[PDB]
Design a protein around this ligand. Sequence first.
Ligand SMILES: [Mg+2]
Ligand SMILES: [Mg+2]
Ligand SMILES: [Mg+2]
Ligand SMILES: [Mg+2]
Ligand SMILES: [Mg+2]
Ligand SMILES: [Mg+2]
Ligand SMILES: [Mg+2]
Ligand SMILES: [Mg+2]
Ligand SMILES: [Mg+2]
Ligand SMILES: [Mg+2]
Ligand SMILES: [Mg+2]
Ligand SMILES: [Mg+2]
Ligand SMILES: [Zn+2]
Lengths: 114, 69, 91, 134
Amino acid sequence: VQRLTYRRRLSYNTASNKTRLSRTPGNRIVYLYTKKVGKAPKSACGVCPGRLRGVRAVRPKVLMRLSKTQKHVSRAYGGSMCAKCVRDRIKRAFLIEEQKIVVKVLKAQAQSQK
Amino acid sequence: PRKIEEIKDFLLTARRKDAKSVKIKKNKDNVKFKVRCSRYLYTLVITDKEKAEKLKQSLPPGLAVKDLK
Amino acid sequence: AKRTKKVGIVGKYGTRYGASLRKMVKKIEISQHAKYTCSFCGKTKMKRRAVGIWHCGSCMKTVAGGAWTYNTTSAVTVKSAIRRLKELKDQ
Amino acid sequence: KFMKPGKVVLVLAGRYSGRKAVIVKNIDDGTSDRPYSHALVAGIDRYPRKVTAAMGKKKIAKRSKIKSFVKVYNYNHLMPTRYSVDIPLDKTVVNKDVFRDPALKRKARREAKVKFEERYKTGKNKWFFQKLRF
RNA sequence: CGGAUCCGUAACUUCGGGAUAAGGAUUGGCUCUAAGGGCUGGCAGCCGACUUAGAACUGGUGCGGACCAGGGGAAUCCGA
RNA sequence: AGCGCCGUUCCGAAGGGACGGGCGAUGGCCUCCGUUGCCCUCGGCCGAUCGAAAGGGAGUCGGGUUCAGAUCCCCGAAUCCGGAGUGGCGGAGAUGGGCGCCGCGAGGCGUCCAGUGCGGUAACGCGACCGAUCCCGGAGAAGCCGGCGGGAGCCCCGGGGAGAGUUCUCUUUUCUUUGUGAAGGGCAGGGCGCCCUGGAAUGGGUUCGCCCCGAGAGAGGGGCCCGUGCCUUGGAAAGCGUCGCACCUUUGCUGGGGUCCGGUGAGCUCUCGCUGGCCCUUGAAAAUCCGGGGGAGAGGGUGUAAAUCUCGCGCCGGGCC
Ligand SMILES: [Mg+2]
Ligand SMILES: [Mg+2]
Ligand SMILES: [Mg+2]
Ligand SMILES: [Mg+2]
Ligand SMILES: [Mg+2]
Ligand SMILES: [Mg+2]
Ligand SMILES: [Mg+2]
Ligand SMILES: [Mg+2]
Ligand SMILES: [Mg+2]
Ligand SMILES: [Mg+2]
Ligand SMILES: [Mg+2]
Ligand SMILES: [Mg+2]
Ligand SMILES: [Zn+2]
C-alpha cells in the first residue's frame, strides 16, 4: 500500500541492481541492494552438472576474505576436482603403469627367445 | 557486535586497552554490560540481579561507567 | 485417444506451409527429437544439443553425428570402407 | 582370499588419497560396530624427496625424514596391489584399539615411521617408496 | 448480435481447419440440499478457501439490467 | 606531389621487469639488514592507447537534523582495500619418545631421536596448516518461453489495546496504527547428478508433466550449499498514535501500550531452486581473484626455540570529479 523509490541514480531494472524490500526499525519499507549470488566451483573433467562440495559459493573478489579451510578440501585436488574423478585418475594411472610394466616384460620375454 | 556467554572472557575484554566505554542497561529481568571497543561492542546479558549487583563492583575503576536510564 | 488422423508432430504448424512440405519435414521431425540408445552408456538418452551434436544424459559423452539422425547411411558405409581399407594390405 | 597383510594397498578416497598403504590386519567378516569388511593399514604420508650425487650427506639425512600414518579403511575405498612389503609389524604397538587414544596413535605412527625408514634406506622395494604420479 | 452455461454445428479441405459456422434455451433476489479437504489417537474429535450441480419461494418476463462487447450466409477476381 | 592516407599484426633487434646466485660500493644501533653498479639463469607480447554515469567491477546500514542536503551532515552500529624496515601483542608450527641416575611418590638431571597440525571407513570438518619458476582448472561468464515448490512484502479474516466517526433506530459496529537495518552465531526451510549398510522382477518408489534404477532402486544412517525466514548482540535509550507538567523566540521531560495470540489462500509483486520445451537462431569478451599438481629452496635443531600463518585482536591512511 506504500510505494517507495530507488536509493541510487540507477533507474533501470538491470542486473547490477537487484533490490529486496525490507522493514526498518523506523516502521517503513525500503529497498536494499543484494550482491549477485556466487556459484560453487565445478570440477575439471569430472562430473559435469555437480558442483564441488565443501567449498564456499561466493563471488570471486570475496575469496580474498575467506580462509583456506573454507575454500578447499583436505584431499588431493580438493577445490579443483570432485571425489569420483580423483579415485578414477588414481586407478587409471596405476593400471596403465602396470600395463606398461606388463608390455615391458613381454618385450623382454620375446627378446630372450628371438 | 559480539555476544559474550562465559564469565571469564568479558572481564578480560573489559580490562583491555580499547575498553574506553562501559555501559549498563537495566531491563525486565535482564542486565546488559556493553563494553565498547575500537572494532566491536561486546554485550554480556544476565537474568539474575544477584549476579549483577556483585559483578558491577568488579569492573576496573577509571573506565567511565555510564548507567543507562 | 487418437487426436489426429494422419498428421503427427507437424500438427503444430496448422494449415499453413502446404501439405507436401509438412509431409517431408515430418520424417525428420520424428527422428531429430526422438531419444536414441547411447552406444556407450546403454540408455535411451541421446537428445541432440545442436546441429550434429548429440550428448547423453548419463555420462555426457558427446558425439558428432548427423544433423537430423544419430548416424547417416553415408557415414556408415564410409566407416565400413575405411575399416576395409585399413585391414587390406596392412593400412 | 588373496588380500593378506603382506601386500601393498592403494587408498582411493580419503585424506590420504593414494599413499601406498600396507595392511597390518584385515577383517573380512566384519566386527559388530563395523558391519562392512575392512583392513587396518599403515601408509606413508610424505614421500622422501629425490637424492643426487651433488646433495651432501647432511641433505640426504634431511630428505630421508618421512612421515607415516595408520588408519582403518573399507575395501571399497582401497585397491590391492601385487607388490608386497616384508617388514615385521608387531601387533602390540599397532592395534585396532589404538584409535581411542591419541597417545597410542602417536606411538603407533612413530613406530611405523621407523619401520618404514629402515626399509627405505636399504633401497629394497623402491616402488613402495616412490610417489605415484596421478 | 455481442459475456457465460447447456444442446447443435453445413459445403469444401492440404484432414491441421472452416468454427465463437449457422441456428436455439437460460441468466435477477432471497432461503436450501448434495459433492469436491487437512490435522490429532490406538473407525472418532476439531479446523478454514470458494467452486459446481439440483430444487423450492418471489419480483409488473425484469435479469451481461451500468460498464465491458464477433452481424451472418451464398459467390467471383487477386495475393498462399 | 602533398596536408596525409591504407594497414593493427602484418615485411619490426617492438619484454627495461622479476625469483635466485656471484663480484663490487654505500647507509641505518656496520651484530643484522635496506639499496646501488655489473655478470649468470629464467621470462610469447596475443602488441601502445581510447572505447559503457544501463555490460563486468571488493566493501554502509538504522535514527535525527534545514527555509534549500542525505546511504554525504550528527549520533550509534559495521565493513573493504593498502602499510609495518629496530618485524605490536596472543594462538598455531611448540614441545613427545627411548636409555641411565637422583627422589617413597609427584618430579629433576645427562645423551640420542622425532616433531613443516589434526579427526571421520567414507561424502568431509576445525581457530591457523612453509612454499619459487612453471603448469592445469574454476569463478567472473550467460538465449527465450512454459510449468512446479520455498521465502519475503502487500492484500484478507478472527481476537486484544490506543485514538477517531455515527448513534432519530440498530450495530461488542466502522476507520488509522500495533517495529527490528547492515554485520556475526544458532535453529527451522529448500536443493544435491554427495557418502556408507544392503540389492530388486510378483518390478519399484515417484511428478501437475516427465523422469530414475544392476553404470546400484525402495529403506535406514550421514555430508555439503543457500539460509533474503525465526531468536539472540546491535535493540529500545532512538522512531511512531494516545492522554500530560514547565513554555509561548530558555519547550525539555514524564508512563504507560507498542518487540500481543493466530489462520487461510490456483491472490498480486520480487527473489531462489527443480524440470521441460524451442533451432539450418547456441545466445560476449577482458580486468581482478581463487583452488589444485609439481617440490627449485628456507628454517632452530631440542625439555631452548626458529622458518611461515589465508587465525583472534590492536595502530595508520584512503587522493580527484
Ligand atoms: Mg555498471
Ligand atoms: Mg453453396
Ligand atoms: Mg464461413
Ligand atoms: Mg448445510
Ligand atoms: Mg498478402
Ligand atoms: Mg576505459
Ligand atoms: Mg540516517
Ligand atoms: Mg530534497
Ligand atoms: Mg587488513
Ligand atoms: Mg513463485
Ligand atoms: Mg541477519
Ligand atoms: Mg505465499
Ligand atoms: Zn553416454
